[PDB]
């Protein structure tokens, strides 16, 4: 059991337990007033301060209040400033601070907290592992990598640090190098290693290198509840949504959108072509490490349900056209973008993040031959003026082996079986 009472607190252990018993009993209002009195009588008490913060924490959960919780987050820190604070109490208070900071989206704050923790406990490997996550949550894979390298130099068989190290490696396109860490890290069974991200990226890493054992891991990931199936490997999912690789316009119910895209396809093309000719800079190279080779760029009109205003100044009639269809402009888990691929481009088999969207492709400029797209076990081609519809949460693959460039328009829609409340509540992706 932890040692949370310094010698001073032991002289008031009776009052401390009385207050804590109230909170443990569930009487939060009067327990807060207890610890508040205790912090009043003994401002130098670390346990009275910690009990105040826990009660504020319990109050925030009850009222579902972020503001109340931010109070607790500050009180957790004050514990650290008081005289002669027991190590167990200090670590417990700053860890909950960081945890709650992450809960609120204060990732920069959680990071500073984790950094202070690591200095106060340089032998605690778990705090380093947690620090690495702090860096990952901000997108700082460089400092995150250093952290896990400093962990594995001391504890090289910690699986938690292995999977996170391998994840960072594959993110950096160290395909072969990431496979052992990801594999060994999952095989350890350590807490935190049973994460669909590692199964996903392990198998995908194997695919790229040719290791046919990948689908053995995909199946395992399906057994552990990460993937809806071996072929549909998205991780941000609403369970129960109809799952099939290819849809028809009628099956989606978005038939007025499909009609509007197909009837006005030349307009959509010409505005895309005009941006290509007069503003190539608005087309951005694919930057998700999905290409084996070739030229692939995208010009994005909508993302996360946000209209890109400068992009729409280059395709203004197309954006206006699309505004009549909230099923796609309001899709906060998809995009609306032009997509150009040049000859000699192969796109790795990959999967989208979420099964809450369906992906329409409107063909704009389709070379007579060389271009095709696979989703799951069906390969199809594009047609100028025609819409394809597939679920990109299924594995899909693309080839551009033509003599000239290939332009399409990509329009994501909410999965039709999603309710209006889910379309307004799901966090953006």
């Amino acid at each position: 059991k932890p040692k949370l009472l310094n010698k001073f607190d032991k002289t008031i252990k009776a009052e401390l337990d009385a207050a804590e018993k109230l909170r443990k009993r569930g009487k939060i209002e009067e327990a807060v007033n207890a610890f508040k009195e205790l912090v009043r009588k003994y401002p130098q008490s670390p346990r009275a301060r910690y009990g105040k913060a826990q009660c504020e924490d319990d109050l925030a959960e009850k009222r579902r209040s972020n503001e109340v919780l931010r109070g607790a987050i500050e009180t957790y820190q004050e514990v650290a400033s008081l005289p002669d604070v027991p190590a167990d109490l200090l670590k417990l208070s700053l860890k909950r601070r960081s945890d709650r900071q992450q809960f609120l989206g204060h990732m920069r704050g959680s990071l500073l907290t984790l950094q202070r923790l690591v200095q106060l406990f340089p032998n605690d490997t778990s705090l380093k592992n947690d620090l690495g996550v702090g860096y990952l949550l901000i997108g700082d894979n460089d400092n995150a990598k250093k952290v896990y390298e400093e962990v594995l130099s001391v504890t090289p068989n910690d699986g938690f640090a292995k999977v996170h190290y391998g994840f960072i490696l594959k993110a950096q396109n160290k395909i072969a190098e990431s496979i052992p860490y990801l594999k060994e890290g999952i095989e350890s069974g350590d807490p935190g290693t049973d994460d669909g991200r590692f199964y996903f990226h392990l198998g995908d890493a194997m695919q790229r290198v040719g290791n046919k054992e990948a689908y053995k891991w995909y199946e395992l990931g399906h057994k552990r509840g990460h993937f809806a199936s071996v072929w549909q490997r998205s991780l941000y999912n609403v369970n129960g949504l109809k799952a099939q690789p290819w849809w028809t316009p009628k099956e989606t119910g978005y038939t007025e959108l499909v009609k509007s895209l197909e009837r006005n396809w030349k307009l959509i093309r010409d505005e895309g072509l005009a941006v290509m000719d007069k503003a190539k800079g608005l087309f951005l190279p694919e930057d998700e490490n999905l290409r084996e080779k070739g030229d692939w760029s995208q010009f994005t009109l909508w993302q996360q349900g946000r209209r890109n205003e400068n992009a729409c100044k280059g395709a203004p009639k197309t954006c206006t056209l699309l505004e009549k269809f909230p099923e796609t402009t309001g899709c906060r888990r998809g995009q609306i973008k032009y997509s150009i691929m040049h000859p000699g481009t192969h796109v790795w088999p990959h999967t989208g993040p979420t099964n809450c969207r369906l992906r329409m492709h409107l063909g704009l400029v389709i070379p007579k031959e060389g271009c095709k797209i696979r989703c799951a076990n069906e390969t199809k081609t594009w047609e100028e003026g025609k819409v394809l519809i597939f679920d990109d949460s299924f594995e899909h693959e693309v080839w551009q082996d033509a003599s000239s460039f290939r332009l399409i328009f990509i329009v994501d829609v909410w999965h039709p079986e999603l309710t209006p409340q889910q379309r307004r509540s799901l966090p953006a992706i």
Binding site: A60, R64, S65, N66, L69, Q102, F103, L104, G105, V133, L136, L137, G139, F167, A171, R197, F200, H201, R233, S234, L235, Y236, E286, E288, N289, L290, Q303, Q335, H350, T351, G352, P353, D392, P427, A428, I429
Partner: peptide, 17 residues
């Protein structure tokens, strides 16, 4: 991310909101 799943986290947390 957008077309793939190569980032540690894709969503943002906002407490109880």
């Amino acid at each position: 991310x957008k077309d793939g799943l190569g980032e540690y986290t894709c969503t943002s947390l906002e407490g109880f909101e």
